[PDB]
Amino acid sequence: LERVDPTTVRQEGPWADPAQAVVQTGPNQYTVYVLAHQWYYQPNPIEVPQGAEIVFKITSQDVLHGFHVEGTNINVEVLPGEVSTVRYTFKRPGEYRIICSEICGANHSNMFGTIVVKE
Ligand code: CUA
C-alpha cells in the first residue's frame, strides 16, 4: 500500500507541480501523476502517446474520488493519503473522458477530465 501525506501533496512530491505530471520512464513507458480535487482533475488534459504503456499514479488532496476512463477497464477509487496505480495502453488516438465514479459533493456530476492520446 503506497501512502502519501494528503495535506502536503500540492507542496512537495510528484503531484506538486502540475506541469510535471507526465514523466517518461521507458522508451514507450510513461507515468502520469493525477491529483483529484473537489471538483477537478490535475492535470487536464492528460496527454500521452498511442501504444505506450501508461502508469497512472492517482491520489486525492481532499476527499474520496473516482477515476474511470470511459471505453477502458480503468475504474479505481481515489483515497486521500493513498496512491492508486492503474496500468493501461491506449490502442486508439483521440480523446477519452475521465469521470468521477465516487460521489464527492456538490460538483460531482460535472467532475470530468480529458485524456488526449496522440498518434
Ligand atoms: Cu470526485 Cu465525485
Side-chain angles (χ1 to χ4, degrees):
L1 211 168
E2 188 180 353
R3 296 183 171 276
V4 294
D5 190 341
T7 73
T8 66
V9 283
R10 289 182 53 87
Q11 283 78 45
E12 69 184 341
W15 295 271
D17 185 356
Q20 299 177 352
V22 183
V23 187
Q24 190 179 9
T25 56
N28 304 292
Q29 290 62 52
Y30 294 83
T31 299
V32 178
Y33 293 99
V34 179
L35 182 60
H37 311 63
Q38 292 171 309
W39 294 266
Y40 74 94
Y41 293 98
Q42 171 199 304
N44 188 9
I46 295 154
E47 294 170 337
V48 299
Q50 184 274 324
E53 296 171 324
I54 309 307
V55 180
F56 293 102
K57 297 280 182 182
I58 317 159
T59 191
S60 171
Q61 78 108 25
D62 37 52
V63 304
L64 165 69
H65 295 288
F67 187 89
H68 170 230
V69 185
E70 297 184 331
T72 76
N73 65 339
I74 304 161
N75 194 8
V76 297
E77 286 186 345
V78 185
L79 292 181
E82 311 183 6
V83 180
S84 299
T85 297
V86 188
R87 296 167 191 271
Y88 194 78
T89 301
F90 293 90
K91 300 182 61 174
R92 304 286 298 268
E95 291 179 30
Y96 298 73
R97 192 167 74 163
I98 306 169
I99 65 172
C100 187
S101 45
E102 295 292 344
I103 301 171
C104 65
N107 296 319
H108 154 76
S109 59
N110 284 30
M111 179 166 172
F112 305 123
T114 299
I115 297 165
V116 181
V117 175
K118 296 298 183 321
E119 172 167 315

